[PDB]
């Protein structure tokens, strides 16, 4: 009984969160009304990790939906599995955050944070033994970014020894809503470096490129990008939701994936990504999964080195052939794996494949290549900040310039820390 409390905040956070519950509810046999209609005991084995059990055999997601405007959570409540969510777990305001980190973190968000924690506390008080928390949000807006990181800070204060996990959508000028995204992202990365234990970086540019070039989607939509996020989220949580010879709770994952506390930002990858009925052999899954075009970080792993790698293979396949393929990828590209962490590539197998797939592979890498994602943000940030462009939106909410300088210095330090271990040798 290792329960996880899920929190989804802001527009992006709730749209990706909704599709995630839609995906795993299907995998666990839960229908849109909370009733289990599965055919395997493996589906109910670890069902309590993400779902609460009510009367009448109903399963209710342990999910808290947060936003500063009602629009997005109304769409969820009326969406496919909207009925499945606990009515009391909808916590929203009316003002909105105006894509302004300071509003979500300081002004509008502070006015709403206490009631979110009341719901968080209610969910935690009923867990037999709480693993930790997972947050879905974007970094480029105001609510998920600014209030999201405020919620993390207060959860740290009340649950200092629980694992704090996030799925964080990084902005990109190619898939941008506002010019202030680099400001909001830089401020959030500062909070994340200090308060989260594991952050899966999801780059909207990578999601876009994959939809355009690999999937052959002429005009991708946010819905298309969120399908990749749903799939990736289901993959990285497979070994928490299903039985296997792996166990793996949140803390044990962090211990083996994070050699240094600041460097806890992961690049996730998924395969297949086909535009379809063809059977994909194990070598095809492993070549694709590790290809850059299959990664959601918009970072070229060949530009850095893997500190640690964790992969899961789903479906009925040769477990011997899986080891042969994973061992072949490292022993044929050894320059991109650090040699001072023995056996830093680990693989797990699960027999239940995702919906509509004979088999799949998801992997997370703690790679120093991620530094290029932070360099891009830092570049866009300084271009505007050097001229103080758009700052009045933030100073008008009580923030001072010094707080921007601190967040920038800290993120630039993070880049230097990655570059330090990228050159390290035995």
């Amino acid at each position: 009984m290792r329960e996880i409390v899920h929190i989804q905040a802001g527009q992006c956070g709730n749209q990706i969160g909704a599709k995630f519950w839609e995906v795993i509810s299907d995998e666990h046999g839960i229908d849109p009304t909370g009733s289990y209609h599965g055919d395997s005991d493996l589906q109910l084995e670890r069902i309590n990790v993400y779902y609460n059990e009510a009367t009448g055999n109903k399963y209710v997601p342990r999910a808290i939906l947060v936003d500063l405007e009602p629009g997005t959570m109304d769409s969820v409540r009326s969406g496919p599995f909207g009925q499945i969510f606990r009515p009391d777990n909808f916590v929203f305001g009316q003002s909105g955050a105006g894509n302004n980190w300071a509003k979500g973190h300081y002004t509008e968000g502070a006015e709403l944070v206490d009631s979110v924690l009341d719901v968080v506390r209610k969910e935690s008080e009923s867990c037999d033994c709480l693993q930790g928390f997972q947050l879905t949000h974007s970094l480029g807006g105001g609510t998920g970014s600014g209030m999201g990181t405020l919620l993390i800070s207060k959860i740290r204060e009340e649950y200092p020894d629980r694992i704090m996990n996030t799925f964080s959508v990084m902005p990109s000028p190619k898939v941008s809503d506002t010019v202030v995204e680099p400001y909001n992202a830089t401020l959030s990365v500062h909070q994340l470096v200090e308060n989260t234990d594991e952050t899966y970086c999801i780059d909207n540019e990578a999601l876009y490129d994959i939809c355009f070039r690999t999937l052959k989607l002429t005009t991708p939509t946010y819905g298309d990008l969120n399908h990749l996020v749903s799939a990736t989220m289901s993959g990285v949580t497979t070994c928490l939701r299903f039985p296997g010879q792996l166990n793996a709770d949140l803390r044990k994952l962090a211990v083996n994936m994070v050699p240094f506390p600041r460097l806890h930002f992961f690049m996730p990858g998924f395969a297949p990504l086909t535009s379809q009925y063809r059977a994909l052999t194990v070598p095809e899954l492993t070549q694709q999964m590790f290809d850059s075009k299959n990664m959601m970080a918009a970072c070229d792993p060949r530009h850095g080195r893997y500190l640690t790698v964790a992969a899961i293979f789903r479906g009925r396949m040769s477990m011997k052939e899986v080891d042969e393929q994973m061992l072949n990828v490292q022993n044929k590209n050894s320059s991109y794996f650090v040699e001072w962490i023995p056996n830093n590539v680990k693989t797990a197998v699960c027999d239940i494949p995702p919906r509509g797939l004979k088999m799949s592979a998801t992997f997370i890498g703690n790679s120093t290549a991620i530094q290029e994602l932070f360099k891009r943000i830092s570049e866009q940030f300084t271009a505007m900040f050097r001229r103080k462009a758009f700052l009045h939106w933030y100073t008008g909410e009580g923030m001072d310039e010094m707080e921007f300088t601190e967040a920038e210095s800290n993120m630039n330090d993070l880049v230097s820390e990655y570059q330090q271990y990228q050159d390290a040798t035995a």
């Binding site: 800070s153 740290r156 200092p160």
Partner: protein
């Protein structure tokens, strides 16, 4: 090549064959260790909550 100490019973036997002759911390101390580690965990937590209170 000598055998010695041949013991036999109903469920087996045992013998020796020679081929060539030759040529703590107290309970208190453990408590201090544990409680010292607990204290250092309390200090680190205090610095977190102190940092968070600021």
């Amino acid at each position: 090549m000598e055998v010695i100490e041949l013991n036999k019973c109903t469920s087996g036997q045992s013998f020796e064959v020679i081929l060539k002759p030759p040529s703590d911390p107290s309970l208190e101390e453990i408590q201090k260790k544990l409680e010292a580690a607990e204290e250092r965990r309390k200090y680190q937590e205090a610095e977190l909550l102190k940092h968070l209170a600021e």
